[PDB]
Design a protein around this ligand. Structure first.
Ligand SMILES: NC(=O)c1ccc[n+]([C@@H]2O[C@H](COP(=O)([O-])OP(=O)(O)OC[C@H]3O[C@@H](n4cnc5c(N)ncnc54)[C@H](O)[C@@H]3O)[C@@H](O)[C@H]2O)c1
Ligand SMILES: NC(=O)c1ccc[n+]([C@@H]2O[C@H](COP(=O)([O-])OP(=O)(O)OC[C@H]3O[C@@H](n4cnc5c(N)ncnc54)[C@H](O)[C@@H]3O)[C@@H](O)[C@H]2O)c1
Lengths: 345, 346
């Protein structure tokens, strides 16, 4: 045959050394040498990499200089192309429909960051219940008076998560782990809203109580956990109507996608006292954090580290290489497909 | 006749109003109206409050005008005193042995903050596996480039706690809640080191594996959880020798007391890169936090907020009031004695 040709966007592997060596056994890996989005579309128009059968993206932050993967750039891929495999769950940067129209199969890396992301979210919930963020800022002043004033100030407002209600917006895979840790580890109760209902087992295992609308979920919650896929339909899913329905002095955390929560609404609900504290690992104008949120006492903000753990990367690398391996050499279907499903070689 | 007499040290109840009503009700509650220490010694000499049978202290910061509770002060108490129940875990301000020399039973508020303090440690554990503290500071620059560079920089070292080893120094009530949360919550593994063994029912539940020395525990640990009482025995317990025996790139969290861990041995270990990260709620020179620790990217620091939750203080009041009711009206022993245990009355 003998060696199908894989285009690699950005870096080679950093963790699964043996598996990456076997992968290079097995396929001719062509480095993309990315410069500009435009430079890469020029490259594709000039047949610079030749015909190639697969594209591999080994990390979320790898290959970004090729973005966006819109119709226009996709119109230039060689027709030999069979499969594109990418790290990550989100593929906001990718027109999956333009890619499927060319008979190209897509695979993401769904599942790899579950443990990671659910942990960060557990960290956020801890943080907004105990006001730990404000606490750390005080400690880091290195000032004796501040340390004491704050240690006392926090005591008027901090609460154990235990017996308080976590309102899950979405009850997908990462929210199931989040829940299980809040319910069984921290002792919170669960109500959730979701497009579809959890099975008998998940509900009876987490004590999940479903409700019909977001407003209902808001009404019932002491802290809300947003964990939904991001799309047009989820943009500003969390807005003014939602904060108006929440209880005075409640809490919210986001590990899903920034613009799923209206930053302006959020800011307004903290200023008014509707929310006591909020925790964001994602930001509507990412990489720009809200200057107003920072400026506030009780808002925990992190640099999108939800899935950022070495084990997650181990899995991004495993799954991308395994998918291509399966789909081109083994005649097996993709392990983590997304969009239209094609036949293996 | 009915109603034993209780001296109230400082302010009345602030959270459990209805319990405080029934208490008051059951007992003649006499406010100390404290002025100063000597002032309280003199009220006691003059018999200002008459005989009483209990003292109740409802918040850690109440009645501090009476400190110290030294032998000279204790020696003027009415011979009718049988019990003193207090808010707090610590009692540095009290000479316990002297109180006991006078047949007075003592009770603190052990366990009141088991939920609070275990949760705060779990938080810190999350913080030192994931370098979240670093990430927080990075976010608050509000500089887009910092955001991305730190996003990427954390990826070089952050790890799931899942499958890694939590080494419990001390396995009392707080650690057991920490292990529980770390083990079945996070999927961590647990080895421990404690002057007392823990029973089948516990070790089987937490999958707990006991070792015999600090040096051992340091070697088997991916993350060290320090949670021991602070005394003579435990001063500087975690020292240069301990950090010497710890796996390269390991981590440590303290929720116990400041000096249980040598601040200088800690700084060194962090500087050598023997430690990746560490999380301190309590500080050697509290309330002064290490200014070296502060400048380090990978050190999480909080203002002693372990037990600082509204529920903890709800429970200080529950226990102090319930302790005196059992001991004096229900013929039952204290729930949380500390020091010599004495027989009740009804
Ligand atoms: N913080 C991070 O670094 C990080 C990392 C990875 C993923 N995430 C986020 O997690 C979120 C999704 O969770 P997942 O992918 O782990 O599990 P999943 O794929 O199973 O999530 C989808 C779940 O949400 C429900 N859902 C689908 N569409 C919805 C909508 N329109 N409105 C409300 N609910 C809907 C579905 O029933 C399903 O249960 C995504 O937003 C994703 O971007 C965050
Ligand atoms: N950060 C906070 O706000 C805060 C709040 C509550 C408790 N604490 C701390 O928790 C610690 C006590 O833990 P606890 O409340 O679970 O009480 P505990 O008595 O149950 O904990 C002590 C445990 O350690 C063991 N032990 C005692 N001395 C030891 C030693 N010298 N070496 C090794 N093991 C020893 C005991 O068997 C016991 O199991 C104290 O330092 C206390 O200050 C801090």
């Amino acid at each position: 045959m003998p060696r199908p040709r894989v285009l690699l966007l950005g870096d080679p592997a950093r963790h699964l050394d043996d598996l990456w060596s076997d992968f290079q056994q097995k396929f001719e890996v062509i480095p993309a040498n990315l410069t500009t989005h435009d430079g890469f579309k020029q490259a594709l128009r000039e047949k610079r990499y030749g015909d190639f059968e697969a594209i591999i993206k080994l990390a979320v932050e790898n290959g970004t200089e090729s973005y966006p993967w819109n119709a226009d750039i996709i119109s230039h891929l060689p027709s030999s192309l069979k499969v594109f495999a990418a790290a990550g769950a989100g593929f906001d940067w990718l027109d999956l429909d333009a890619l499927n129209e060319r008979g190209v199969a897509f695979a993401n890396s769904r599942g790899a960051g579950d443990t990671a992301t659910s942990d960060l979210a557990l960290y956020l919930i801890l943080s907004v219940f105990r006001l730990a963020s404000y606490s750390e800022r005080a400690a880091r002043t290195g000032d004796p008076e501040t340390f004491n004033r704050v240690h006392l100030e926090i005591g008027k407002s901090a609460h154990n998560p235990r017996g308080h209600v976590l309102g899950a917006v979405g009850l997908g895979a990462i929210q199931k782990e989040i829940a299980r840790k809040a319910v069984h580890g921290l002792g919170m109760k669960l109500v959730y809203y979701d497009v579809a209902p959890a099975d008998a087992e998940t509900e009876k295992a987490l004590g999940a109580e479903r409700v019909d609308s977001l407003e209902e979920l808001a009404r019932r919650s002491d802290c809300v956990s947003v964990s939904v896929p991001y799309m047009k339909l989820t943009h500003h899913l969390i807005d003014e109507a939602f904060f108006a329905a929440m209880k005075p002095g409640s809490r919210i955390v986001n590990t899903a996608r920034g613009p799923v929560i209206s930053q302006d609404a959020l800011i307004a609900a903290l200023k008014s006292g509707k929310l006591l504290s909020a925790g964001l690992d994602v930001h509507e104008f990412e990489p720009q954090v809200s200057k107003e949120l920072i400026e506030m006492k009780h808002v925990t903000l992190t640099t999108h580290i939800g899935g950022v753990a070495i084990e997650t990367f181990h899995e991004f690398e495993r799954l991308t290489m395994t998918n291509i391996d399966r789909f081109l050499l083994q005649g097996k279907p993709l392990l983590t497909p997304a969009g239209k499903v094609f036949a293996p070689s």
